[PDB]
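Researcher: For the annotation table, I need structure tokens for Cofilin, non-muscle isoform. Please keep the output clean. Sequence:
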Amino acid sequence: MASGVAVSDGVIKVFNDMKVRKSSTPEEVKKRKKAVLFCLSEDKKNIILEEGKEILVGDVGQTVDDPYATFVKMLPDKDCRYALYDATYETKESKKEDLVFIFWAPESAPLKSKMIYASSKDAIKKKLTGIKHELQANCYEEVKDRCTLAEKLGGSAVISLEGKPL
């Protein structure tokens, strides 16, 4: 075989920011990374992060009518990626948000970017340290389903996944 994968540490650097809501004023809270999509290093054996594959939250009402759409959009089935999505629902009380690790691993992915990632599923967490929530999918229907992603946050009372998507 040829298994192997070593995180570049930074994966935690960006994760430590995803755990918390890096914001403050009204001109920042909207610029929160709703989901950070990672990607296997060039070496093909090191867990690292991307540069231009992170969807914000304010985009929903800034330059993106559908934020959740941007995800699956750049979430092909030929490229296993790791994303830390933080769905925002509005139950019978007030708008909230739940951080989750949308484990995107398309079973139809390339063995040259699948045999690692898959087996890497545990290697990555080595840095996450038992991530709170999670949601692994292998189909646009499973990843592009509000009801599904709304399960990790509690879709019992959730009237919407963003006052629109649901």
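Researcher: And a one-line annotation?
Model: The chain is about 25% helix and 25% strand.
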